[PDB]
């Protein structure tokens, strides 16, 4: 039967058939990696009375890849919370040797963007299962949530913190919990219990010795945050926002929020895919007074750029533009150097805040719900490149910012 | 686990909606439910 496919061949096949060498898909060319062990060593956390608590990573292993921040809380209301584990965390600053190297500022905002931009339906739904609790459960039910902090080294094991190579200083992150009684809306006068579990990798002596002794240079990502006031009126107003960013970036994300809850649209609800609830009509990026591209509509930034950059589009209110052709993998494939261009600008045109009862009497393409007048601010995030040099037991950044 | 548990909000239906068991709600609608 199928053998007919192999006899009826000719020159046309020369461009798809390989040589007599082992480049076939069978006779597997086996790859092998060294033996290792991993352990989740619990970290003690100092008291967090609505303040900063330091989490110090001790030398209980060779590499650390991820930090799991576990919070146990109880529901105090009939309102279903929206990522209450991420809303409770307000920021996390990671420092190496005392130098701050990575920051997540306005933390619930970045992690909701991160989840929508980076996580697939199974990973996205799972991340919700360990951060949200939404059955119609009674008030007072206690659940533990398992929040992974999206630090630069968590995405691929090979960039895990090379702690064995940092013999003269520690690594720590300062996590602050501002309040349970402000935005989640589920407070029950209950101080949540916070525990942190992190992993360690243990390598055998051949690589452990090589790794602890040799000089290393890791290309890492840094997160930069900016925000400003962004009101919207009943007419098509524009805004010209300075972009105070540095270093090569792969992409930038900007979003409009009602910073009272996790809502980026006038719908009053999360995950709205209807542009009738989103303000931005069009936007362009500008560098030193010269325009990078012709103004593209707001919907372009929420649904088209994501297809090439992520293979995944966020809900409306989250707008992304990429400079590289792949923004989730480890290899850099295109970036714009914000340290060489002196004046970076984001220019936004909005739709008119004139609409109401959107499902019935929404205008055609130039308006959005008047509820947009309750929006207060725009946040801009970008991921930049830097280099983590580890030499003679000390580490740090090559490019200071 | 996706779609087999319940919903958040705002189900738009272009066709019918058929149930076996019971429905727990009430509002204005078609010709009935208004007398």
């Amino acid at each position: 039967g199928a053998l007919n496919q192999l006899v009826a061949v000719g020159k046309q096949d020369a461009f798809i058939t390989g040589d007599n060498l082992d480049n076939s898909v069978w006779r597997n060319v086996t790859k092998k990696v060294s033996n290792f062990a991993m352990e989740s060593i619990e970290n003690y956390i100092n008291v967090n009375p609505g303040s900063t608590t330091s989490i110090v990573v001790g030398r209980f292993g060779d590499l650390v890849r991820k930090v799991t921040l576990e919070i146990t809380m109880k529901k105090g209301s009939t309102t279903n919370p929206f990522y209450p584990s991420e809303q409770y965390v307000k920021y996390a600053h990671l420092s190496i040797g005392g130098q701050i190297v990575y920051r997540i500022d306005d933390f619930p905002t970045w992690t909701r963007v991160h989840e929508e931009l980076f996580m697939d339906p199974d990973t996205r739904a799972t991340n919700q299962r360990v951060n949200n609790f939404r059955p119609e459960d009674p008030v007072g039910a206690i659940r533990k949530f398992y929040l992974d902090i999206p630090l630069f080294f968590t995405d691929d094991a090979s960039k895990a913190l090379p702690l064995i190579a940092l013999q003269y200083h520690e690594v720590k992150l300062d996590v602050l919990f501002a309040s349970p009684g402000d935005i989640p809306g589920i407070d029950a006068s209950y101080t949540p219990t916070v525990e942190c579990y992190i992993d360690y990798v243990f390598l055998d002596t051949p690589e452990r010795e090589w790794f602890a002794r040799n000089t290393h240079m890791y290309v890492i990502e840094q997160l930069q945050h900016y925000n400003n006031v962004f009101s919207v009126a009943a007419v098509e107003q524009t805004k010209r926002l300075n972009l105070p960013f540095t270093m090569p970036t792969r992409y930038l994300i900007w979003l409009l929020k009602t910073g009272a809850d996790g809502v980026y649209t006038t719908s009053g609800y999360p995950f709205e895919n209807n542009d009738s609830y989103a303000a931005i009509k069009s936007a362009k990026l500008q560098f030193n007074g010269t325009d990078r591209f012709s103004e593209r509509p707001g919907y372009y930034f929420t649904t088209v750029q994501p297809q090439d950059a992520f293979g995944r589009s966020p809900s409306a209110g989250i707008y992304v533009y990429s400079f590289g052709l792949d923004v989730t993998g480890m290899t850099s494939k295109g970036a714009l150097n914000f340290s060489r261009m002196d004046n970076a600008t984001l220019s936004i045109t909005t739709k008119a805040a004139t609409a109401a009862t959107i499902s019935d009497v929404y205008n055609q393409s130039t308006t959005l719900a008047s509820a947009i007048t309750d929006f207060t601010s725009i946040a801009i995030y970008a991921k930049s490149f830097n280099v983590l040099k580890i030499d003679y037991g000390m580490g740090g950044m090559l490019f200071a910012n | 686990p996706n779609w087999n548990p319940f919903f958040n909000r705002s189900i738009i239906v272009s066709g019918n909606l058929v149930v076996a068991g019971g429905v727990i709600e009430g509002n204005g609608g078609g010709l009935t439910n208004s007398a």
């Binding site: 279903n80 119609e136 | 779609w3 087999n4 548990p5 319940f6 919903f7 958040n8 909000r9 705002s10 189900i11 738009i12 239906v13 272009s14 066709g15 019918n16 909606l17 058929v18 149930v19 076996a20 068991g21 019971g22 429905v23 727990i24 709600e25 009430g26 509002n27 204005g28 609608g29 078609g30 439910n33």
Partner: peptide
Amino acid sequence: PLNDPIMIRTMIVYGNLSATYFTGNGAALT
């Protein structure tokens, strides 16, 4: 997908519901 809207044994909805037609027993308000 959202194109085989068939459920077994459970359902609850928070918001409002919109539809063309309907069926089932009645324990409704007003």
